Design a binder for this molecule. Structure first.
Ligand SMILES: *CCC(=O)N1C[C@@H]2C[C@H]1CN2c1ccc(C(N)=O)c(Oc2ccc(Oc3ccccc3)cc2)n1
Length: 271
């Protein structure tokens, strides 16, 4: 009411129920809004974020809307540091879900997870919005088994320098094309490279990419023109789609619209 804009939530309307995860970035909890509506609540650690820049960007993020993209409900900012409030995802992080061997996945279930992520990325590309850190650790799973894309654009507002340039000890070297590692050249085509590495994580049941190499050794392998090889659960046609994302020339890599068409054609033939 009085005092709050359309992007602002009053924290007095929240009830807290159970913890969901905890890290250097903060803690995440399950709760209710005005008694009845399921939410997740991310509590940002003091000193970790450029907060006034993030609040201006949240206004734009509120107007993004797609079934396969995690929905932002609003932010709490009158009491630094802030809360970020989103839709609830009961089955948690995609990386941990893939590593549970009890699920005994069929290959048709693995291809449907790839299609969910590709639809979300086609929508972001149509709005000229870059992810900048796409990976299995940044996707979530709901009560019905549907995968959605999370943490979109968030790396722009993080203050710890070990995470922010190619040299840093926490930069995503294993998800980066040659022109990022050599020159810091980010574009639509660096998100396309990262999507190919995510398909390799899904078909490998959550293995670390380049599993016997350090970050330093991975950067050298890539610059010399060498690549990941075929997971045992991927057919020849599926491997051809992930490999097309890794061309040395950025301009010869596909768009997200073309990748979606390739994935639907293989679903029809392998059905
Ligand atoms: C493998 C990663 C992992 O273990 N995580 C990610 C975070 C912390 C821990 C579990 N987890 C998590 C679980 C469930 C939810 C949920 N919605 O039910 C969740 O919710 C989030 C995630 C990210 C947020 O921040 C954000 C910023 C920008 C754009 C979108 C979202 C907010 C809530 N996290």
């Amino acid at each position: 009411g009085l005092g709050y804009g359309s992007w602002e939530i009053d924290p007095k309307d929240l009830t807290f129920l159970k913890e969901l995860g905890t890290g250097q970035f903060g803690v995440v909890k399950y709760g209710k809004w005005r008694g009845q509506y399921d939410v997740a609540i991310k509590m940002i650690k003091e000193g970790s974020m450029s907060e006034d820049e993030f609040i201006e960007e949240a206004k734009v993020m509120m107007n993004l809307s797609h079934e396969k993209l995690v929905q932002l409900y609003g932010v709490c900012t009158k009491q630094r540091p802030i809360f970020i409030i989103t839709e609830y995802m009961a089955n948690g992080c995609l990386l941990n879900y893939l590593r549970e061997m009890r699920h005994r996945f069929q290959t048709q279930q693995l291809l449907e997870m790839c299609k969910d992520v590709c639809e979300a990325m086609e929508y972001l590309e149509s709005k000229q919005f870059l992810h900048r850190d796409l990976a299995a650790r940044n996707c979530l799973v709901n009560d019905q088994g549907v995968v959605k894309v999370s943490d979109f654009g968030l790396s722009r507002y993080v203050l710890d320098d070990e995470y922010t340039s190619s040299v840093g000890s926490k930069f995503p070297v294993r998800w980066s094309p040659p022109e990022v590692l050599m020159y810091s050249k980010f574009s639509s085509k660096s998100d396309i490279w990262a999507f190919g590495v995510l398909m390799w994580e899904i078909y490998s049941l959550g293995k670390m990419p380049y599993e016997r190499f350090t970050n330093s050794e991975t950067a050298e392998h890539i610059a010399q023109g060498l690549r990941l090889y075929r997971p045992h659960l991927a057919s020849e046609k599926v491997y051809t789609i992930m490999y097309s994302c890794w061309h040395e020339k950025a301009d010869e890599r596909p768009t997200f619209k073309i990748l979606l068409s390739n994935i639907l054609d293989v679903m029809d033939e392998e059905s």
